[PDB]
From a paper:
The first reaction specific to the DAP pathway is the condensation of (S)-ASA and pyruvate into HTPA by dihydrodipicolinate synthase (DHDPS), followed by the formation of THDP by dihydrodipicolinate reductase (DHDPR). In plants, DHDPS is inhibited by lysine, and thus is a key enzyme in regulating lysine biosynthesis. The structure of the tobacco enzyme shows that plant DHDPS is a homotetramer, made up of a dimer of tight dimers. The active site is located at the centre of a (β/α)8-barrel in each monomer, with the lysine binding site located in a cleft at the tight-dimer interface.
In order to further study the structure of plant DHDPS, crystals were obtained for a truncated form of the At-DHDPS2 protein in both the unliganded form, and with (S)-lysine bound at the allosteric regulation site. The crystals diffracted to 2.0 and 2.2 Å respectively, which is much greater resolution than the structure previously reported for Ns-DHDPS. The general arrangement of the At-DHDPS2 subunits is identical to that previously reported for N. sylvestris DHDPS and V. vinifera DHDPS, in which the enzyme exists as a dimer of dimers. In this configuration the active site of each monomer faces outward from the tetramer, while access to the allosteric, lysine binding site is via a small solvent filled channel formed at the dimer-dimer interface. Analysis of the structure using the EBI PISA server showed an extensive dimer interface (1800 Å2, 15.5% of the total monomer surface), and a smaller interface between the dimers (609 Å2, 4.6% of the total monomer surface). Consistent with these previous studies, our results show that this configuration may be a general feature of plant DHDPS enzymes. Analytical ultracentrifugation and light scattering studies show that At-DHDPS2 exists as a homogenous tetramer in solution, with a modal sedimentation coefficient of 7.0 S and a molecular mass of approximately 140 kDa, close to that expected for the tetramer. An overlay of the (S)-lysine bound and unbound structures showed a surprisingly low difference between the structures, with Cα RMSDs of only 0.29 Å and 0.30 for the superposition of the tight-dimers (i.e. the crystallographic asymmetrical unit) and the authentic tetramers, respectively. The scattering data were compared to the theoretical scattering calculated from the crystal structure, and showed good agreement at low q (q <0.12 Å) corresponding to the overall shape for both the unliganded enzyme (χ = 0.91) and enzyme bound to (S)-lysine (χ = 1.20). The experimental scattering profile of At-DHDPS2 was unchanged by the addition of (S)-lysine or the substrate, pyruvate, showing that there are no large conformational changes in solution caused by ligand binding.
Author numbering:
A (entry chain A), B (entry chain B), C (entry chain A), D (entry chain B): 59 to 365
The structure:
Amino acid sequence: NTDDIKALRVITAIKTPYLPDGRFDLEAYDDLVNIQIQNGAEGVIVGGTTGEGQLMSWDEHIMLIGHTVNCFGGSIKVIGNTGSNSTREAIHATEQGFAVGMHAALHINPYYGKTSIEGLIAHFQSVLHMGPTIIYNVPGRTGQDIPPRAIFKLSQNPNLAGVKECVGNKRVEEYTENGVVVWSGNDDECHDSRWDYGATGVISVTSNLVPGLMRKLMFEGRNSSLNSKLLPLMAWLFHEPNPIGINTALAQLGVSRPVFRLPYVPLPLSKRLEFVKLVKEIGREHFVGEKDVQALDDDDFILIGRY
Amino acid sequence: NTDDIKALRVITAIKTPYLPDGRFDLEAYDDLVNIQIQNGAEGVIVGGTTGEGQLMSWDEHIMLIGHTVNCFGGSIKVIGNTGSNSTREAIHATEQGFAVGMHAALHINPYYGKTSIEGLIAHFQSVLHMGPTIIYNVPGRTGQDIPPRAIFKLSQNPNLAGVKECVGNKRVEEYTENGVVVWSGNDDECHDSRWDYGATGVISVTSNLVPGLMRKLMFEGRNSSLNSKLLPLMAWLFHEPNPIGINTALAQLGVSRPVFRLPYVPLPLSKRLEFVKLVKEIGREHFVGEKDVQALDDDDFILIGRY
Amino acid sequence: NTDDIKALRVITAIKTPYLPDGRFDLEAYDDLVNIQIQNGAEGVIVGGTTGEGQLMSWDEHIMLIGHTVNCFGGSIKVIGNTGSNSTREAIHATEQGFAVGMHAALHINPYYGKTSIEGLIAHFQSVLHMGPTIIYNVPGRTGQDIPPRAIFKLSQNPNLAGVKECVGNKRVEEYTENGVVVWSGNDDECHDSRWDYGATGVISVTSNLVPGLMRKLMFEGRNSSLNSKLLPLMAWLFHEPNPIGINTALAQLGVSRPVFRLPYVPLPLSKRLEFVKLVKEIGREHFVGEKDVQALDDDDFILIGRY
Amino acid sequence: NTDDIKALRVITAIKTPYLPDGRFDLEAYDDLVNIQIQNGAEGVIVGGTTGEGQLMSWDEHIMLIGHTVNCFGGSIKVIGNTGSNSTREAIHATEQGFAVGMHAALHINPYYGKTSIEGLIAHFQSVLHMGPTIIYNVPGRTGQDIPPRAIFKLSQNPNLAGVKECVGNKRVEEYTENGVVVWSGNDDECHDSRWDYGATGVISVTSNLVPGLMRKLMFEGRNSSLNSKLLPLMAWLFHEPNPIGINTALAQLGVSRPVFRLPYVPLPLSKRLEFVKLVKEIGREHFVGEKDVQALDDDDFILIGRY
Ligand code: NA
Ligand code: NA
Ligand code: NA
Ligand code: NA
Ligand code: NA
Ligand code: NA
Ligand code: NA
Ligand code: NA
Ligand code: NA
Ligand code: NA
């Protein structure tokens, strides 16, 4: 049901942890999702940009969606990232994702092989009838900014829950004043987005580390001091393109193995030492896991091309 | 070998034509490649952006590469587009494409899931050892500008044939003054790139329509007035994102069926009528095929999502 | 848990119904599984021989397993047919099947590319540690009879629940007297298997049609008159190789569309008219669905090669 | 064309050799194919039962077919094993194999998921129109004997080159007396099949080891005493199911690494010592490779499940 999706305020784009041969580490993944549920996250994106959906084959991606539904689906909404630059793959992945029980789909506009606005309506109308859907706009990654007029045409459809918008707060405000539900896709704008520009909440990378504090930020009212205490951590997470930062941090916290699927590689030791300092300044009690944060050596990280 | 790739001036990024149910039309495709050869095209990109590689399953893509080598590889250089935003996919695709006899690989940087410069080097080093390689920079589509210092680093590998560059002539000139071979990836700049900025030639969309005129433009010296005559056709071809124009034009000339794989959809009737006038203005004798150019009705087009 | 698997007496090898384009018809499939649960079936095999697992790609097979777990897993045991003649595919399919929540795996010995008894131990030891497993012996289909000494070596493993045995009642008796749990794989021997030769129950094709009567046969004591009332129906179901008969019958009952994935084709009209007679003789009230049985025309059946 | 396939007498079902991690060893493979050509083998089956097609993903299989055509197709006929128990897979594999330039297809009847005779005709008619085809009957592996009346029906299609027959010489003679071309698929019968029962030649495992002697046996007339000399080697090659013997022997001769994809595992040391004596008895000069034959230690072998 679309209404239940519209009501979510804190959705985590969860990291996908790996075994040293490159396969998914499901035991670490289950720990991560349980920690999200214990700290009040309401939805998870499975295999989103942060979860490296772009590196998965479809069988391991549908497996990870079905696993998340089967183990956690009664305790958290499971939103499968089933969009694609290929309409055929978007159709196939979305209907299989809904068949294994996911609650909603996250759909990006076709990236790299971008299409016309007419082709973009055709793409989205291919999948929207399948179930509750959030459309995702991030032109810095896709090469194409979805214009609001396209979203307005698509919200005829009762399955469009709303938009994950990365353009910025002026675009968030244009949508929310036109009655479209919006989740900020930018951790470092989401507090203002929520309290000043009518956003419902955030689909977050930073909640992978501090899910309790992100929930506080979206639920307890304007808190501009909590916000600026999180800003240095947010900057660190985006120093190189996401998920490089989160992959590095979860490995330092010991909740994920230091295993990267290429083309991602970790942040260097100088940044890893800043992370040890950030954990101390914010307080280890707010971060996921209970192990002592480690700096790690560069040689701890396994970079895998063939898996 | 690499030197033979570096010598190519006219490389057509060939359109992939379809049967009425979405499968590849190999008879139409073979007609296109033969026409290219007969008009002096010296290389083809198989399954590039123009060839909708992004919409192919890997089995039909490797099949199209091996078929092109088997039928035409003694008459034209066959360059497989075996790049990906996933290093795993780029490694497998590339080694398999070389195993079936392609002469070179085209490698884009990771789009959408963009990585750090260090990750970008690791990605390209994963495939550069496999055979002659052209690196493709198109930040308008990928979200990321490959910096010259990464190219200078990678050019130490003797398998780097050069770069397909879309940033513009000032970037072309920075490479070519330093000894890196460049093909312009922008048809509307390629004449000046070739004669004024040291580009070896072009990896062209427009050559799918007027391969003889593109050949003349790359070999017979500066000719502003020929260039000026082609600019309106080139503008039309990129009115919407490629390959929407070329797919519409080739259906109008009768050399490809009017079948689109989504998310691409044809240009509207007013643009198709403009194309009929472009062909008459330039001269039908310069365009591929023998059939009279047609406007086509909207109803002639078949759009396919499930294939 | 293996003990819970050992205790099952009536497992249905459920048919996989199709839409006219060849995709799975999940709405019909859900009706079928609900009807099994309402008539007391205790387990279902998903994508077994009867379910045409051999014709599925792995993504649709894992999807169908995850779907069955998510919709029915609290009401019936879900046993994924994840075995293969390739050890690599067996490993991959089994661990993904268990990850989406299936309760057990059905594993055939490598068919067609058969291996030595030493290779067969190596194959099974690759997957047995993954969770509760039933080994399936059907030399009439595989070309290789698994010798009891191999099963005895493998029952060291607490995950081996038992064997689905198709060789016949003398082989069932050799296993059960040696303390191996056995499910008869032959509907027309399963009554004697159960009451005279120590079999626990049956993994059945016939239960797809008359699940209530098959449950009666396995639970209520020796009933040789009920058995011989079912014998003509059982013979009909195996007149050509299974699943040809069941696919034809479910279409006649209107619970499945008359759509066959090749290489299967339906029984001819003379056999379909015998089925109408069998339903009347046994009583429509005992068969799945509520629609009036139809003979169907040959032209009702859609035979699909490309899907 | 078909006539050129019908003329072949010596077809080697080539072994597929592996690198230490399970990937294909193309350098070893190319050495094997060159040795076959140099000893007068006239065709190769790529990825047949002997070549472990059953263990390949389709991408590596089409790659191996296109590679063989690209490197050797001007010197030897390349027959792809593109058959399957799934018609969908047989259709796709076969059309793609012909598109990359294979000269013929080898098609087994559906094994394990066996179908009715009518279904069997529908399966083969799905692929026979695609190019020259050899039908493979091996009921010991498939569970089903293709009846002569199905072959007589299918031979009306001019693309049927003939049959690889394993039932024995009486079945060979029934075909050949009626004008159907037969290759014996049984090495230990092929001499008599060739000279006494009208077989055109052999699709051979033993030719991977002694291709010159197999050629002599197929071209230079009856020679019982040469045949008798090879029988012990042929017996050894099928002591366990093929390809276990040939994979062990080629590792002992040094022309393939001692790497097995599961579920195959090497013959034990006593059989390997017997092989060293067979080579000495027949003469090393007749066996492929130049290196001294070795027994190998059990520890030299690498068995791989995950690759
Ligand atoms: Na804590
Ligand atoms: Na914690
Ligand atoms: Na120049
Ligand atoms: Na012309
Ligand atoms: Na022309
Ligand atoms: Na009833
Ligand atoms: Na009923
Ligand atoms: Na003869
Ligand atoms: Na020799
Ligand atoms: Na030799």
